[PDB]
Amino acid sequence: YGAAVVNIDLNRDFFDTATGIDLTKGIPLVQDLLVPIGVTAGAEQSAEY
Amino acid sequence: NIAVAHTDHLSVVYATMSNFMLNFTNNFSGNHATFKPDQYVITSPEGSYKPIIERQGETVDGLTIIDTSIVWPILCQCTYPLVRIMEE
Amino acid sequence: RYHESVLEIADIFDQADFIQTSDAVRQLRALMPTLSTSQIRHAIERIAQ
């Protein structure tokens, strides 16, 4: 009782940090894989998706 | 491995350098078969004749002669900002 | 009167074990930043990491 909202997330227990994935934001986010060239710092972040 | 650094970066450097105030001549039209420089002289009835472009051979400045071997370091031994991992 | 445009090999060939042309992989590539071969190599080296 009182559960405000119930989502269907990717399983962090399965897609562990050992996978390099970071699910806390609600999307997978693997750093330093498909990083773009020739852009300002912080512009890499969308490619983490 | 380096072609992106040439086409997707250095090319802009050419594109902007081409608009510089002092690059006033038309250096090349993209067609080897037909291109020739426009050629001019200061000249007077009084008798002066001063070609702007002229062939005098090697000069003290060291601009006249070209070592084409410069291409090798450009390929086989030069880093670029694009390659590589991210650089501003 | 024309329009220059890119044409992916997947927009031409559609062979099952030659060219992956699943709409999933397609839209996944649609997400990707423009890539150089050094970037691709970096992606591989990351997955290996």
Side-chain angles (χ1 to χ4, degrees):
Chain A
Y1 194 98
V5 82
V6 177
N7 291 24
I8 303 180
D9 301 25
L10 281 167
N11 192 18
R12 267 192 283 282
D13 300 330
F14 177 73
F15 303 108
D16 45 26
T17 57
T19 333
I21 308 188
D22 183 87
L23 282 167
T24 66
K25 251 45 183 307
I27 63 175
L29 287 182
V30 183
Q31 291 190 7
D32 204 30
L33 201 154
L34 280 191
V35 38
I37 315 297
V39 285
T40 17
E44 46 86 16
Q45 291 176 22
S46 67
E48 285 178 10
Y49 178 57
Chain B
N1 203 31
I2 76 188
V4 44
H6 277 228
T7 64
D8 302 87
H9 187 14
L10 189 67
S11 65
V12 336
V13 181
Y14 286 120
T16 87
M17 274 204 293
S18 59
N19 304 117
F20 282 7
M21 166 192 313
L22 289 202
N23 313 345
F24 62 95
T25 52
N26 262 18
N27 288 336
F28 173 55
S29 75
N31 179 21
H32 290 85
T34 68
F35 183 74
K36 280 288 173 207
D38 299 331
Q39 294 160 40
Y40 290 100
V41 293
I42 324 280
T43 180
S44 45
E46 292 77 7
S48 173
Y49 188 95
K50 289 292 195 308
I52 270 70
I53 316 174
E54 51 179 355
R55 196 246 187 167
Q56 308 299 338
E58 189 169 3
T59 60
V60 153
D61 306 327
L63 307 163
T64 282
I65 299 300
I66 288 93
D67 212 17
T68 87
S69 42
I70 192 62
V71 299
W72 302 109
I74 286 184
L75 237 182
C76 286
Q77 68 145 158
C78 266
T79 62
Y80 298 85
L82 272 249
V83 186
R84 353 282 183 113
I85 182 184
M86 53 179 180
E87 187 180 359
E88 241 77 15
Chain C
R1 188 181 182 227
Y2 58 83
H3 179 236
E4 204 170 32
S5 60
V6 115
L7 212 247
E8 284 168 8
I9 254 72
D11 297 331
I12 329 184
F13 298 83
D14 197 334
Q15 269 271 17
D17 285 299
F18 190 19
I19 324 272
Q20 180 52 274
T21 45
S22 188
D23 186 31
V25 166
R26 176 123 43 191
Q27 62 186 35
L28 181 46
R29 288 198 328 265
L31 295 194
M32 292 173 176
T34 291
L35 301 132
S36 90
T37 81
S38 52
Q39 283 160 262
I40 303 175
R41 185 188 301 121
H42 186 83
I44 279 145
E45 284 178 5
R46 183 61 175 125
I47 293 187
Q49 187 174 0

